[PDB]
Amino acid sequence: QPIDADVTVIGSGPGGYVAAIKAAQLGFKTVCIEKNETLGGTCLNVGCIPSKALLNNSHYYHMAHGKDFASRGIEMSEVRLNLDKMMEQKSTAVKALTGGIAHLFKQNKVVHVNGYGKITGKNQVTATKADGGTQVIDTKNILIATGSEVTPFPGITIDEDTIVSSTGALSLKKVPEKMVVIGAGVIGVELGSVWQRLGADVTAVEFLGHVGGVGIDMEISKNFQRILQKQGFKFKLNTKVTGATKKSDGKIDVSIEAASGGKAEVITCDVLLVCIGRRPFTKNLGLEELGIELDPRGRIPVNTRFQTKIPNIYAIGDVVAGPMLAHKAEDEGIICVEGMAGGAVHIDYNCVPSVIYTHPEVAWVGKSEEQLKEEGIEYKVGKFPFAANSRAKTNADTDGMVKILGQKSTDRVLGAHILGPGAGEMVNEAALALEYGASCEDIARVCHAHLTLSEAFREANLAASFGKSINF
């Protein structure tokens, strides 16, 4: 059973499976190790894919069940939710995407190994199967892509039945009457918005003073919060959770308090969602025997070439430092594999966008106003509301705005922050501009197609550069 490889990838997540494919394309004999039943890691199985599927489906449910479709001349007697059918469509997307990775591995002649991976030597990886079966691989370089896992709340045991994490919250069998989310981060706000649309009464409790996680612009966060409240999403900010106990009748009691201290309360809910964070996963990887020490938060220290302390062992994705996003792990996998083949390795995390797929969407890349103030950077602001964008008005969906942050002297774009329709696609134009160091005037002078949401992005850059836009 011995196999020999040039590169051995542990984990089949976005970082792991993309890194594996690129290595084969570079000419390396490549092996990939996955312990779970399917390829694709967190994002495809319990992450991006199922959550975005329910966000899109719940959004169309809201459009038909509400007043939107009636205003367009689409008349329906009565709209019913079929949660089982909605969940199967989610499952059909997960199944096609997880299955696609195996087909991509086969097309590129990438060897798939089923089992739990352990690095037993400098040039050796051993995969153990479920039955006790064993697989040893002799390889020159190792790439660690073991990813992340849920962060447990100390003193709450998640049973994935009525006190749930992101995984269980994605597969609820019926709509809860009242739901509590622990943490108003990107994950909590998306999942809470799904169940809010489907009929649940959702309240979010957050220790910090804002929604959307770290890196989000504060003005964007407050406006995003006001819009969600108008939808029915409730928030208890600057409040801490002390404990949660499931009562005998079936209702969970969550004890909350003001984060600073005081204002004690207990809230009861049918379903409790705990998503306060994620953390790198290195359990049973045996780093100690290799001498690879973890940082205080559990990450593998790595250098700019994504080498660990041992030159032939690398680490990428959520298991190393940086923002825990799928496209971030996908890029580290590509360049790390390119670096192994002698190529250059460079990545700018300031050019990494973040997207929240609620409705309205939120997206941003680069620096926020708070970051610029802390660094002492002199900047100017350009804003353009979606109420003045022709596509948004024609659609009758005009929440939010585009905010551009530009250098005061050079007019260079330092940050783009979008709240409203089409934020996700729009931030990609912003990332391309930041990669090139483009100015606000540059974007203002590029001819944007009439009746696109991206015209708001152009006009906001015009307001930051010229001082005024045309349509507002």
Place this chain on the structure above:
Amino acid sequence: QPIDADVTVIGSGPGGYVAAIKAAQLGFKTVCIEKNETLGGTCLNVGCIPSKALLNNSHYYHMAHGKDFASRGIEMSEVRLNLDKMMEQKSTAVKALTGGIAHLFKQNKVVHVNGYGKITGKNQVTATKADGGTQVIDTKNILIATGSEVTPFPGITIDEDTIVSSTGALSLKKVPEKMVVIGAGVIGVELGSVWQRLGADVTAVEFLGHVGGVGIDMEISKNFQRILQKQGFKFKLNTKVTGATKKSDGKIDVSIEAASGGKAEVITCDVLLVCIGRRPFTKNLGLEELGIELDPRGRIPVNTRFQTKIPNIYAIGDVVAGPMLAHKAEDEGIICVEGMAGGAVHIDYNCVPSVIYTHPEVAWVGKSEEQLKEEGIEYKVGKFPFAANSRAKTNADTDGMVKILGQKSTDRVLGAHILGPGAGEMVNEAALALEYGASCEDIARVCHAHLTLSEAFREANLAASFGKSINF
């Protein structure tokens, strides 16, 4: 009552009203003259705005009335069309956009003169009102933005009742049982697609050998045609219309033959849509008395500052050469007015995008394969199908692809052509790339937000640059 002005703009369409606002913001005393009851010209009143409104409205009708919403767990007993309510939604959007132009003229202190403008001298414009009153404007500069009108078909009379132009097709009071469209250009394909979704039996008769107009890539046109045909849109290509007769029964008989000439045939329809094109509009503007001769197609010849043969008289928009598009006219108005203030004037018609708002959408910018072969340019092709895009599969909407055309030696992007979901927004990123002269590798190396349709644009550039993509 004579008025003194620095700039006098004739026409309040996208070129005219944008040029008027920018000139006022630049410090000029500005006057804008409009003969029609509302501001906004063709695009806002009978053009982009009402057609795109009906396109998205009929699209939502097709998903609710069709198989899409039922597969997402959204269950409805009976879906019925209320055409008057749908036309009401269209009219409400037209009224909000035209009214917004009046407010922007008020905010920027644009003098709005209602009436028919005529150039009565080199530095004089005379507006004649409906009641015969006259308003004389003594002005330093004149800007002609008199726009376009529908091209009449020789031997066919349009009454806007059962033989209609685009204007009449936008306000039909009943879904025709059968409709024939003369012209399979961008306008014809959109309007035909709207009425096809609402129940019409639609056939388009096109003189050329492809659908989508001039400049569209042939491979994209053939694939776009195949998808529309499977939706039920029928096409008779390389076919011209020789005549149309209103029969006694109330149905129109359309006589057709091969565009080059051949055996005649008859097809019958309830409503005939004539959109074979549009032509520049300069009627009774006083060009003959000034010495401004028109070109063979009716356009005003202008130099790089958009000046006519008379240096202080300018022309922009649909009345001059170049793509007859709203964002093309808006940009010409901006730079022309900036040139009047001494600034540089630059527009690259190769970087001006084109969008068709069907479902699937079509969008492109730069050069097609035919143009590159015609120019003798050695290029390489990168393609990525939307079937391999994670966002498309999660949505279950995977028609089409992204095709990138790159220079064979320098890897520089020469053209981007998108057929599928979100092409309209995606093309604006492509326009910025062309503006900077980006390479395929540059775009592939920019970090695109995961779960966006724009990832297909990135991977198509990776396929063109490296030779292979990751997920296909």
